[PDB]
Amino acid sequence: VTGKGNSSESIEAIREYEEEFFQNSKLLKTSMLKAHQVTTRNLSLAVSDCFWKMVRESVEQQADSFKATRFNLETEWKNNYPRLRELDRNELFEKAKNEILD
Amino acid sequence: ATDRGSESDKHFRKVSDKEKIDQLQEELLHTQLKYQRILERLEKENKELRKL
């Protein structure tokens, strides 16, 4: 529910269009559109509620792949790099620096 | 550890458990179990002889 309007039009212009377009146009006079489809708040709510439902349903199981990845990395380390730790940009640099200085 | 069945069994068991708690079974916990109350009520309705 928007019109060409301008970039300065407020959100309440959307409510004004929700009234004028649908009370004036065939969208309600001929029942082409349902009232709950007129409301953009219903789009917002339908997205939000099902969004958090999908969150609660699916996000939890992402731990299985996280654990599998950690297991694979630690397995490669144990098999080949038992001395390997969180040897990120800082730790390897420090060890190389100390060896160089020595 | 090398060429040992025990390590393969441990790896298989860990992966199997991770799959058992994966998304395949997670969905069923939110789509099937919550209607077991309705199933139990329908079982109670079925055992009653009123319908028969």
Swiss-Prot record, chain A:
Signal sequence coordinates: none
Binding site for GTP: 2, 5-6
Function (record text): Constitutes the soluble short form (S-OPA1) generated by cleavage by OMA1, which plays a central role in mitochondrial inner membrane fusion and cristae morphology. The transmembrane long form (L-OPA1) and the S-OPA1 form higher-order helical assemblies that coordinate the fusion of mitochondrial inner membranes. Inner membrane-anchored L-OPA1 molecules initiate membrane remodeling by recruiting soluble S-OPA1 to rapidly polymerize into a flexible cylindrical scaffold encaging the mitochondrial inner membrane.
Protein origin, superkingdom: Eukaryota
Source organism (scientific name): Homo sapiens (Human)
Subcellular location(s) per record: Mitochondrion intermembrane space
Region feature G5 motif, mapped onto this chain: 1-3
Lineage: Eukaryota, Metazoa, Chordata, Craniata, Vertebrata
Protein's recorded name: Dynamin-like GTPase OPA1, short form
